[PDB]
Amino acid sequence: AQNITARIGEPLVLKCKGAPKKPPQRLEWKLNTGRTEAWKVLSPQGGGPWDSVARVLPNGSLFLPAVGIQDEGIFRCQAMNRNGKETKSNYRVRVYQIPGKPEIVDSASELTAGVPNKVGTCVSEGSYPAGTLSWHLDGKPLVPNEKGVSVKEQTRRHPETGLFTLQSELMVTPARGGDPRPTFSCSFSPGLPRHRALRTAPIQPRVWEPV
């Protein structure tokens, strides 16, 4: 199966290998997606509630005006070149959506060395697939369970759009005598490398010493 990646809302055309450029053609598309209850067979004439979703073009290609999450799955075309030459097409379709730029909320103006502190919470909205948030300290990545560094993550899917909202709360135990002016930042990294990572504005808290 050939892997196809389309952006949500964008149109998609799937070629039918070995199909006559002009009608009439002996072919049938059969797809298994989030819209299909099982395997759905689409004929060149079509006809139904599928015409506004997935339509076979005069040249035999499968056309989707605007792909969505529900359209992820397998697309297969069995065409008949005049005779009895037969050609198969196998497509695995995955879709994606870029979230808005990640924001940091509830950030600490100051924090105290030697004890756990709540640095801030990173929030990313409107992404598909979910993806991951990652915190950075002065450029270098922070790793949980190591030196008082911990995160409180949660992923949430919108009931209608199916898009994801990410939340990452960072907690650090700053070393006494460490950097009094550290720089933190949160980055969003998508599932597939369809785009570059998105990074928050930096937060620059003060590190005070305990009495």
Swiss-Prot record:
Keywords (A to Z) from UniProt: Cell membrane, Cell projection, Disulfide bond, DNA damage, DNA repair, DNA replication, DNA-binding, Endosome, Glycoprotein, Immunoglobulin domain, Inflammatory response, Membrane, Nucleus, Phagocytosis, Phosphoprotein, Receptor, Repeat, RNA-binding, Secreted, Signal, Transmembrane, Transmembrane helix, Ubl conjugation
Domain of life where this protein originates: Eukaryota
Main location: membrane
Tissue and organ expression note: Endothelial cells. Increased expression in pre-term labor and preeclampsia placentas compared to controls.
An annotated Gene Ontology molecular function: laminin receptor activity
PTM text: Phosphorylated on its cytoplasmic domain by PKCzeta/PRKCZ upon ligand binding. Phosphorylated by ATM following DNA damage. Targeted by the ubiquitin E3 ligase subunit FBXO10 to mediate its ubiquitination and degradation.
Domain (Ig-like V-type) ranges: 1-94
Described function: Cell surface pattern recognition receptor that senses endogenous stress signals with a broad ligand repertoire including advanced glycation end products, S100 proteins, high-mobility group box 1 protein/HMGB1, amyloid beta/APP oligomers, nucleic acids, histones, phospholipids and glycosaminoglycans. Advanced glycosylation end products are nonenzymatically glycosylated proteins which accumulate in vascular tissue in aging and at an accelerated rate in diabetes.
Protein name, UniProt field: Advanced glycosylation end product-specific receptor
Upper classification of the organism: Eukaryota, Metazoa, Chordata, Craniata, Vertebrata
